[PDB]
Amino acid sequence: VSVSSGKNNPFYFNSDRWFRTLYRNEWGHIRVLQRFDQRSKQMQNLENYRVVEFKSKPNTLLLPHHADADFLLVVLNGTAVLTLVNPDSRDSYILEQGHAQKIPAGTTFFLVNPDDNENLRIIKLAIPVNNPHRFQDFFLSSTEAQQSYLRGFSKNILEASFDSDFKEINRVLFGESREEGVIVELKREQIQELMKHAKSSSRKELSSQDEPFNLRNSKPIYSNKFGRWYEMTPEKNPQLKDLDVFISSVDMKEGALLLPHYSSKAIVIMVINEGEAKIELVGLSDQQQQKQQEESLEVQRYRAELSEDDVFVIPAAYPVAINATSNLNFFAFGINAENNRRNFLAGGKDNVMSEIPTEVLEVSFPASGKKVEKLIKKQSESHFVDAQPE
Amino acid sequence: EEVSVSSGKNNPFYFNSDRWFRTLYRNEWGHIRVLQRFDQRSKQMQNLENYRVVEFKSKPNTLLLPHHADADFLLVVLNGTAVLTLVNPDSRDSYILEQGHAQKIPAGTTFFLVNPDDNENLRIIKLAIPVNNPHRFQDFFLSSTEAQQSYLRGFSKNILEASFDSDFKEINRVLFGESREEGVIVELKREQIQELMKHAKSSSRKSSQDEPFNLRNSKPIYSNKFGRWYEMTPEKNPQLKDLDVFISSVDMKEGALLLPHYSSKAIVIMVINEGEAKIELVGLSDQEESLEVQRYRAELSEDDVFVIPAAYPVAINATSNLNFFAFGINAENNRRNFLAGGKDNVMSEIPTEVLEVSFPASGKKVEKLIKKQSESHFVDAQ
Amino acid sequence: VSVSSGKNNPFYFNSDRWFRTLYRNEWGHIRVLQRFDQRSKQMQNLENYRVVEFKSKPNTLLLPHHADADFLLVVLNGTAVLTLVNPDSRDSYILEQGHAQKIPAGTTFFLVNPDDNENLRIIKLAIPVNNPHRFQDFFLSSTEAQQSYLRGFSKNILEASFDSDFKEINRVLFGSREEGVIVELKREQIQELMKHAKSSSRKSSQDEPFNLRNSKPIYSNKFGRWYEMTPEKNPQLKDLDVFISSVDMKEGALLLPHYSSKAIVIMVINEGEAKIELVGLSDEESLEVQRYRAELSEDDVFVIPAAYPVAINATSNLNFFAFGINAENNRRNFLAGGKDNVMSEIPTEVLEVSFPASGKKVEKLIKKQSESHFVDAQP
Ligand SMILES: [Ca+2]
Ligand SMILES: [Ca+2]
Ligand SMILES: [Ca+2]
Ligand SMILES: [Ca+2]
């Protein structure tokens, strides 16, 4: 009580405990995070959002498929070549680390990790269309791990559609063996035959509801010797505006502390790219269970040690702080993002406490307003400060 | 390797008209039926929970009495002709809606509907979006008949006397009836029908949120010897944009096959206007999971409803001349992806190198097969 | 003729029974109405809305805090100084009776009743962000009634954050602190907090408070007056898709039977008493007219589902306020009277078959009432 951690902290999603494997072989894997809403009523409004983590070895290819869900794809580490196959055309995009791209629901696509000696790590925000809680991947490919969805149609339908005998269709499309799974390893020669065509990093990508964007290609919103914060919002990008989601990429050096702060209205889903950190989230809980009886809220403390691939949810308005125990970088999706205001609770810049008039501070706290202000102005830095460990 | 097959009553996406419709009202002049809730039959249709489907049918020279509902309506005339009159607080507007024409009736709008034809029945399908309870709506009839009391009767005598500035005896005799019609659908004399056509606005030209529209009044998006597809999207109509819904009207001749395809993001609710057809919908099952392909099939007939979840491949074989209508939910920017033929075929956009590893045969042999069918959209079912 | 009244009327919320106390001391109280959706499926779409009532004595201050919910604040009685504290600025506004203002979710704010003698009464529509059904107030202050949320952080985090040893942090911020979240201030302190506040100006701002009565009433006669502001006239209202109504009625006046086409209405009695009659349908699908009646008094809340006919008889001079949810293009259809009467727009031939009497007779009855919207109804 008063201090929840582990399974007692519903906002912490340990990567080795809360991810479900959709597919996995020796060339990579796809895992989906368990539902947010099933763990806490305080995440009920994240019910139509799922998080997917993808990782593949060098020279790999995720076979063509589409899903009944909108995807906001982000490359955490490595390089990827995303190809959107449309009914009458196709577009390839080279997505370097930090780049993101929206993939409308039902868009057939495939992507490759063109790197010869580096893995590819991607995180995707998924918004299911048919059932708000779950989506399904439809693979067109026919492998030992799955049958092409085309096999879903009867012989008569297939023959008339392809204008050929089923024996042939079956031999060519369903089965000259076939691949093991949806993730296959290609040779350098196979890559260039279509990769060298893809579109590399664009200029000011944040201007097309179809072109990928790099939130790192912008002036950090916060930046000092302890950390830097890059962020792209609905106000800055079309794809983001449609999803009403903002994206953040935060770098923090060992021993840095991201000061206590809260987002006014955005619900934040963060993922550790690399590094380790200690996080503290502050919530409230009513100890009075008799509805028609006076409420009685007590401060609740939710903590966790975050590591690579871990996911943590910061409900809107909940104060939070992060102490980087090693060089760190985390990414975050801000849901209900439009006009979000990040309120810091210490330091110089963006400190909402410093905007409170002296007289109000005086009655709000034990000490005089003068003394409260003296304490407030003690910290010389803003946003990120020295965690002063040991 | 034979995929699992679910047919007829085992197919949650198929709604046989004689099994899944609940009668809201019926008499010798017509009937109103509401379809069973989508979300209750499958979690894969959970996002259709805010949508109800209503089928209305009435005999020649009939009138559906004035009423309003706590639901937005997208009314479509499948067969026959209708005169829809929207009564507002300060005015009224009558519109002639011929077969294929549609019109949105904002929630709470008092209205009445007439089948002005002397011989043809009127068949209508309506998409309903409830306001108070997301799952259901209620019709508030202002009329007083043997089948129902006016909602005005819900007020007390004193309130009514003060409101109408009349003794209750007069209010009662005039509006409640302490002779009244049998039900909410009545037969009018041919002479009365004409007495209500003088202000009926006939079909016009091309984009108002008030007046009705005709989706079949544009070049079909797909058209050939085997069939044609008419479609109006939210991008082409404000009423449709407000609802984020598109409407389709498809004609297919006997023996025609609507090629395997899927809608990228739209959830489709189709209804058979006339004719018969076989349909196959492809879904999937549930390391942790090995998504297996399932075939949801059914024999479709008049008035039947079938739901095609977004992104699920589907194909239709018309066994007799056929026409069906469809409502596309979550319509904005929907992309129809065909899986065969020489037009809109997403498979023909996949580079050979990818095909090479995506299927057993070589990329060369896959392309060969893909180009075999030179026809597009609709082909001979052979 | 089944009538569901008082305690059995799910749409009626007696203020003396359905409000839960969130905070209360000798200086004021904050109460939240129980959830609408748990009372009836007919109010299921009101599940993302909560109603809060606030009352405080003269010269009082509601301490700095924020909530994970959008608030649409309305001053029913008195005057308030609302100060919104942002990350890098603050804005203070004077809100007189009848004025309203939206407080975006998570905005830290404090509220003062600057009057030296009068109390302050406010009602707020709340739209929760994390749990659609409930929100929580995060008080930054440290009082006997609640500790600052800053105390939720570990000593090491607070020490590094403020660059001070915990001893001093604790004595300054946590620890003589006030008893509760509503405190009485000295007249001198109150004056300092109101002198720089922006007074009520003229005419449509994204942040500025607005007065729904600073416009011509949409309905007005000897017996009643109705002011209304729609999303089509104010950006804050447009963002919420909510309209706000404020109507005055003389004792004995009757607001004629009518219905809102698509808006779900949540009304709150400001002052006075009235008898309300709501008409529903208790459910082929043989529907039956259901009568929902109630005697309303100050602070009571009553919900009128969209499209449901309703009538209100004032039994004393009365004023009520109302929030209209799903407001865009709502059309209020009256069922009697000389204006906005939907019945008067139905053709004779249709009336002829819709009712027992002849069309001309029905029409005769319809035009009997010369008054519009409000009429005198005294027994
Ligand atoms: Ca003090
Ligand atoms: Ca006729
Ligand atoms: Ca092959
Ligand atoms: Ca009659």
Coordinates of C-alpha atoms in Angstrom, one line a residue, chain B:
Chain B
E1 CA -5.0 -28.3 -45.7
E2 CA -8.7 -27.8 -46.4
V3 CA -9.7 -24.6 -44.6
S4 CA -12.6 -24.6 -42.1
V5 CA -16.0 -23.6 -43.4
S6 CA -18.9 -22.0 -41.6
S7 CA -22.2 -21.7 -43.5
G8 CA -25.7 -20.3 -43.1
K9 CA -26.7 -20.4 -39.5
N10 CA -23.1 -21.0 -38.4
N11 CA -21.9 -17.9 -40.1
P12 CA -22.3 -14.9 -37.7
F13 CA -21.8 -12.4 -40.6
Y14 CA -24.8 -13.7 -42.5
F15 CA -28.3 -12.5 -41.5
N16 CA -31.0 -14.5 -43.2
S17 CA -34.0 -12.1 -43.5
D18 CA -36.5 -14.8 -42.2
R19 CA -34.5 -15.5 -39.0
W20 CA -32.7 -12.3 -37.8
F21 CA -35.4 -9.6 -38.2
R22 CA -37.6 -8.6 -35.4
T23 CA -41.0 -7.1 -36.3
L24 CA -41.5 -3.7 -34.8
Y25 CA -44.9 -3.2 -36.4
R26 CA -47.1 -4.9 -39.1
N27 CA -50.6 -4.9 -40.5
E28 CA -52.3 -5.5 -43.8
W29 CA -50.6 -2.3 -45.3
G30 CA -47.0 -2.9 -44.4
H31 CA -44.4 -3.8 -41.9
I32 CA -41.3 -2.5 -40.1
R33 CA -38.6 -4.9 -39.0
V34 CA -35.3 -4.3 -37.2
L35 CA -32.3 -6.5 -37.6
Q36 CA -30.7 -8.3 -34.6
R37 CA -27.8 -6.4 -33.1
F38 CA -24.5 -7.0 -34.9
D39 CA -22.3 -6.9 -31.8
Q40 CA -24.2 -9.6 -30.1
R41 CA -23.4 -12.2 -32.8
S42 CA -19.7 -11.6 -33.0
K43 CA -16.9 -9.6 -31.3
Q44 CA -15.6 -9.1 -34.9
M45 CA -18.6 -6.8 -35.4
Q46 CA -18.2 -5.0 -32.0
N47 CA -17.7 -1.6 -33.7
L48 CA -21.1 -1.9 -35.4
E49 CA -22.8 -1.7 -32.0
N50 CA -24.0 1.9 -32.6
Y51 CA -25.7 0.8 -35.9
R52 CA -29.1 -0.8 -36.3
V53 CA -30.7 -1.8 -39.6
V54 CA -34.4 -1.3 -40.4
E55 CA -36.4 -2.8 -43.3
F56 CA -39.7 -1.2 -44.2
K57 CA -42.2 -2.4 -46.8
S58 CA -45.6 -0.9 -47.6
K59 CA -48.4 -1.5 -50.1
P60 CA -49.6 1.0 -52.8
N61 CA -51.1 4.3 -51.7
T62 CA -50.1 3.9 -48.0
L63 CA -48.9 6.4 -45.4
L64 CA -46.6 5.9 -42.4
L65 CA -48.0 8.3 -39.8
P66 CA -46.1 11.3 -38.4
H67 CA -43.4 10.4 -35.8
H68 CA -39.8 10.9 -34.8
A69 CA -37.1 8.7 -33.4
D70 CA -34.1 9.3 -31.1
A71 CA -31.8 8.0 -33.9
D72 CA -30.2 9.4 -37.0
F73 CA -31.6 7.7 -40.1
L74 CA -30.0 7.1 -43.5
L75 CA -33.0 6.0 -45.5
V76 CA -32.7 4.2 -48.9
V77 CA -35.3 3.2 -51.4
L78 CA -34.6 -0.3 -52.6
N79 CA -37.7 -0.7 -54.7
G80 CA -40.7 1.5 -55.6
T81 CA -41.2 5.2 -55.0
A82 CA -41.6 7.1 -51.8
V83 CA -42.5 10.7 -50.8
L84 CA -40.7 11.6 -47.7
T85 CA -42.0 14.7 -45.8
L86 CA -39.8 16.2 -43.0
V87 CA -41.8 18.3 -40.7
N88 CA -39.8 21.0 -38.9
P89 CA -40.8 23.4 -36.1
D90 CA -41.4 26.1 -38.6
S91 CA -41.8 24.4 -42.0
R92 CA -42.1 21.2 -43.9
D93 CA -40.4 19.7 -47.0
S94 CA -41.5 16.9 -49.2
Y95 CA -39.2 14.9 -51.4
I96 CA -39.8 12.3 -54.1
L97 CA -37.3 9.4 -53.6
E98 CA -37.2 7.0 -56.5
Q99 CA -35.5 3.6 -56.4
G100 CA -31.9 4.0 -55.5
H101 CA -32.3 7.4 -53.9
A102 CA -31.3 8.1 -50.3
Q103 CA -31.7 10.8 -47.7
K104 CA -30.5 11.4 -44.1
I105 CA -33.2 12.1 -41.5
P106 CA -31.6 13.9 -38.6
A107 CA -32.4 12.4 -35.2
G108 CA -35.7 13.8 -33.7
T109 CA -37.1 15.0 -37.0
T110 CA -40.8 14.5 -37.2
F111 CA -41.7 12.9 -40.5
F112 CA -44.2 10.8 -42.5
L113 CA -43.7 8.6 -45.6
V114 CA -46.1 7.7 -48.4
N115 CA -46.0 5.2 -51.2
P116 CA -47.7 7.2 -54.0
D117 CA -47.7 4.3 -56.5
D118 CA -51.0 2.6 -57.4
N119 CA -49.4 -0.9 -58.0
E120 CA -45.9 -1.1 -56.8
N121 CA -44.9 -1.9 -53.2
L122 CA -42.4 0.3 -51.4
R123 CA -39.2 -1.3 -50.0
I124 CA -36.9 0.7 -47.9
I125 CA -33.7 0.0 -45.9
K126 CA -32.5 2.4 -43.2
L127 CA -29.3 2.7 -41.3
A128 CA -30.0 3.9 -37.8
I129 CA -27.6 5.5 -35.3
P130 CA -29.3 5.8 -31.8
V131 CA -28.7 8.9 -29.6
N132 CA -29.7 8.0 -26.0
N133 CA -28.8 4.3 -25.9
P134 CA -26.1 3.5 -28.4
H135 CA -27.7 0.1 -29.1
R136 CA -31.4 0.9 -29.6
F137 CA -33.9 3.6 -30.5
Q138 CA -37.6 4.2 -30.1
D139 CA -40.2 5.7 -32.5
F140 CA -42.4 8.4 -31.0
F141 CA -45.7 8.5 -32.8
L142 CA -47.7 11.7 -32.6
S143 CA -50.7 9.9 -34.0
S144 CA -53.5 8.2 -32.1
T145 CA -54.5 4.8 -33.4
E146 CA -55.8 1.4 -32.2
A147 CA -52.2 0.2 -32.1
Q148 CA -50.7 3.1 -30.2
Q149 CA -51.5 6.2 -28.2
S150 CA -50.1 9.6 -29.1
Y151 CA -47.1 10.6 -27.0
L152 CA -49.1 13.7 -26.1
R153 CA -51.3 11.5 -23.9
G154 CA -48.2 11.2 -21.7
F155 CA -49.0 14.7 -20.3
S156 CA -51.6 15.3 -17.6
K157 CA -55.0 16.7 -18.1
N158 CA -54.2 20.1 -16.6
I159 CA -51.0 20.5 -18.6
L160 CA -52.9 19.6 -21.8
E161 CA -55.8 22.0 -21.1
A162 CA -53.4 24.8 -20.4
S163 CA -51.2 24.0 -23.5
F164 CA -54.1 23.8 -25.9
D165 CA -56.2 26.4 -24.1
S166 CA -59.2 24.0 -24.4
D167 CA -61.2 21.9 -22.1
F168 CA -59.9 18.3 -21.9
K169 CA -63.1 16.9 -23.3
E170 CA -62.4 18.6 -26.6
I171 CA -58.7 17.7 -26.5
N172 CA -59.6 14.1 -25.8
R173 CA -62.2 13.8 -28.5
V174 CA -60.1 15.5 -31.1
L175 CA -56.7 13.9 -30.5
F176 CA -57.1 10.7 -28.4
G177 CA -60.5 9.3 -29.1
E178 CA -61.6 8.6 -25.5
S179 CA -63.0 7.0 -35.3
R180 CA -59.3 6.2 -35.2
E181 CA -57.2 4.3 -37.8
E182 CA -56.1 0.8 -37.1
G183 CA -52.3 1.3 -37.1
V184 CA -49.3 3.5 -37.9
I185 CA -49.4 2.5 -41.6
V186 CA -52.7 3.4 -43.3
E187 CA -54.2 3.2 -46.8
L188 CA -55.1 6.6 -48.3
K189 CA -57.6 7.0 -51.2
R190 CA -55.9 7.6 -54.5
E191 CA -57.4 11.1 -54.3
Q192 CA -55.7 11.9 -51.1
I193 CA -52.3 10.7 -52.3
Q194 CA -52.5 13.3 -55.1
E195 CA -53.6 16.0 -52.6
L196 CA -50.1 15.5 -51.1
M197 CA -48.0 15.5 -54.3
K198 CA -48.4 19.2 -55.3
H199 CA -45.5 20.2 -53.1
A200 CA -43.4 17.0 -53.5
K201 CA -40.0 18.0 -54.8
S202 CA -39.0 15.8 -57.7
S203 CA -35.4 14.6 -58.3
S204 CA -33.1 17.4 -59.3
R205 CA -29.5 17.6 -60.6
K206 CA -26.2 17.3 -58.7
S207 CA -24.9 18.5 -52.9
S208 CA -27.2 19.8 -50.1
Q209 CA -27.4 18.3 -46.6
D210 CA -31.2 18.5 -46.9
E211 CA -32.3 17.2 -50.3
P212 CA -31.9 13.5 -51.2
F213 CA -29.3 12.1 -53.5
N214 CA -29.0 9.3 -56.2
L215 CA -25.8 7.2 -56.1
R216 CA -26.9 5.6 -59.4
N217 CA -26.8 9.1 -60.9
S218 CA -23.1 9.0 -61.7
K219 CA -20.7 6.9 -63.8
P220 CA -20.3 3.5 -62.2
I221 CA -16.8 3.0 -60.6
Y222 CA -16.7 -0.5 -62.2
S223 CA -18.6 -1.6 -65.2
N224 CA -18.6 -4.4 -67.8
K225 CA -20.5 -7.2 -69.4
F226 CA -20.9 -9.0 -66.1
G227 CA -21.8 -6.1 -63.7
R228 CA -21.6 -2.5 -62.7
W229 CA -20.9 -0.8 -59.4
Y230 CA -22.2 2.6 -58.4
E231 CA -20.8 4.3 -55.3
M232 CA -21.2 7.6 -53.5
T233 CA -18.6 8.5 -50.8
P234 CA -18.5 11.1 -48.0
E235 CA -16.2 13.0 -50.2
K236 CA -19.1 13.5 -52.7
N237 CA -21.9 14.3 -50.3
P238 CA -22.1 16.3 -47.0
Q239 CA -24.9 14.1 -45.5
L240 CA -22.6 11.1 -46.1
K241 CA -19.6 13.0 -44.8
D242 CA -21.4 13.8 -41.6
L243 CA -22.0 10.0 -41.1
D244 CA -18.6 8.9 -42.5
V245 CA -20.5 6.4 -44.6
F246 CA -20.5 5.5 -48.3
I247 CA -23.3 3.8 -50.2
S248 CA -23.0 1.3 -53.0
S249 CA -25.5 -0.2 -55.5
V250 CA -24.2 -3.2 -57.5
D251 CA -25.8 -4.9 -60.5
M252 CA -24.6 -8.4 -61.5
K253 CA -26.0 -10.7 -64.2
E254 CA -26.5 -14.4 -63.6
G255 CA -23.3 -16.3 -63.8
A256 CA -21.1 -13.3 -62.9
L257 CA -18.4 -13.3 -60.3
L258 CA -17.4 -10.3 -58.3
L259 CA -13.7 -11.0 -57.9
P260 CA -12.0 -11.6 -54.5
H261 CA -11.3 -8.2 -52.9
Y262 CA -11.3 -6.4 -49.6
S263 CA -12.1 -2.8 -48.4
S264 CA -9.1 -1.4 -46.5
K265 CA -10.9 0.3 -43.6
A266 CA -14.7 0.3 -44.3
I267 CA -17.0 -2.1 -42.6
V268 CA -19.6 -3.1 -45.1
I269 CA -23.3 -3.9 -44.5
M270 CA -24.9 -5.2 -47.6
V271 CA -28.5 -6.1 -48.3
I272 CA -29.9 -8.0 -51.2
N273 CA -32.4 -6.0 -53.2
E274 CA -33.4 -8.7 -55.7
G275 CA -31.8 -11.9 -56.9
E276 CA -29.7 -14.7 -55.5
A277 CA -26.0 -15.2 -54.9
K278 CA -23.3 -17.2 -53.2
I279 CA -20.9 -15.3 -51.1
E280 CA -17.6 -16.3 -49.5
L281 CA -16.0 -14.2 -46.7
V282 CA -12.5 -15.0 -45.6
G283 CA -11.6 -14.5 -41.9
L284 CA -8.9 -15.9 -39.6
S285 CA -8.8 -17.9 -36.3
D286 CA -7.0 -17.2 -33.1
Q287 CA 4.1 -19.6 -30.7
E288 CA 1.1 -18.1 -29.0
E289 CA -1.3 -18.2 -32.0
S290 CA -1.3 -19.6 -35.5
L291 CA -3.9 -17.6 -37.4
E292 CA -5.8 -20.1 -39.5
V293 CA -8.0 -19.1 -42.5
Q294 CA -11.7 -19.7 -42.2
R295 CA -14.4 -19.5 -44.9
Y296 CA -17.7 -17.9 -44.0
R297 CA -20.1 -18.7 -46.8
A298 CA -23.8 -18.3 -47.4
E299 CA -26.6 -18.4 -50.0
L300 CA -28.0 -14.8 -50.2
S301 CA -31.6 -14.0 -51.1
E302 CA -33.9 -11.0 -51.1
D303 CA -33.8 -8.8 -47.9
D304 CA -30.9 -10.8 -46.5
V305 CA -28.1 -8.8 -44.8
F306 CA -24.4 -9.7 -44.8
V307 CA -21.6 -7.9 -43.0
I308 CA -18.1 -7.8 -44.5
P309 CA -15.7 -6.7 -41.8
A310 CA -13.0 -4.2 -42.8
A311 CA -10.0 -5.8 -44.5
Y312 CA -11.7 -9.2 -44.8
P313 CA -11.4 -10.6 -48.4
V314 CA -14.8 -11.4 -50.0
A315 CA -16.2 -12.7 -53.3
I316 CA -19.7 -12.9 -54.7
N317 CA -21.2 -15.2 -57.3
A318 CA -24.6 -14.1 -58.7
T319 CA -26.7 -17.2 -59.4
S320 CA -29.5 -15.1 -61.0
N321 CA -29.6 -11.4 -62.1
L322 CA -28.8 -9.5 -58.9
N323 CA -28.7 -6.1 -57.3
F324 CA -27.6 -5.4 -53.8
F325 CA -27.1 -2.2 -51.8
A326 CA -24.4 -1.6 -49.2
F327 CA -23.6 0.8 -46.4
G328 CA -19.9 1.4 -45.8
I329 CA -19.1 2.4 -42.2
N330 CA -15.8 4.1 -41.4
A331 CA -15.8 5.1 -45.0
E332 CA -13.4 8.1 -45.4
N333 CA -10.5 7.2 -47.8
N334 CA -11.5 3.6 -48.0
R335 CA -9.5 1.7 -50.7
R336 CA -11.0 -1.3 -52.4
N337 CA -8.2 -3.8 -53.0
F338 CA -8.9 -6.5 -55.7
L339 CA -6.9 -9.7 -55.5
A340 CA -7.3 -10.7 -59.2
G341 CA -7.9 -9.2 -62.6
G342 CA -6.1 -6.4 -64.5
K343 CA -7.4 -3.4 -62.6
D344 CA -7.1 -2.4 -58.9
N345 CA -5.3 -5.7 -58.3
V346 CA -3.0 -5.2 -55.3
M347 CA -1.2 -8.4 -56.2
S348 CA -0.1 -7.0 -59.5
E349 CA 1.7 -4.2 -57.6
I350 CA 4.0 -6.6 -55.6
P351 CA 7.6 -6.8 -57.1
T352 CA 8.6 -10.2 -58.5
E353 CA 11.4 -10.6 -55.9
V354 CA 8.8 -10.4 -53.1
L355 CA 6.4 -12.8 -54.9
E356 CA 9.4 -15.1 -55.3
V357 CA 9.7 -15.7 -51.6
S358 CA 6.0 -15.1 -50.7
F359 CA 4.8 -18.2 -52.6
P360 CA 6.1 -21.8 -53.4
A361 CA 6.6 -21.2 -57.1
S362 CA 9.1 -18.8 -58.5
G363 CA 8.3 -15.1 -58.8
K364 CA 8.2 -15.6 -62.5
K365 CA 5.5 -18.3 -62.3
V366 CA 3.5 -16.2 -59.9
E367 CA 3.5 -13.2 -62.2
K368 CA 2.4 -15.4 -65.0
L369 CA -0.6 -16.6 -63.0
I370 CA -1.5 -13.1 -61.9
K371 CA -1.6 -11.9 -65.5
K372 CA -3.7 -14.8 -66.7
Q373 CA -7.0 -13.0 -65.9
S374 CA -7.3 -10.0 -68.2
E375 CA -10.8 -9.1 -67.0
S376 CA -11.4 -6.7 -64.2
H377 CA -13.7 -6.5 -61.1
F378 CA -16.5 -8.7 -62.6
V379 CA -15.8 -11.9 -64.5
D380 CA -17.6 -15.0 -65.8
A381 CA -18.1 -17.4 -62.9
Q382 CA -17.5 -20.2 -65.4

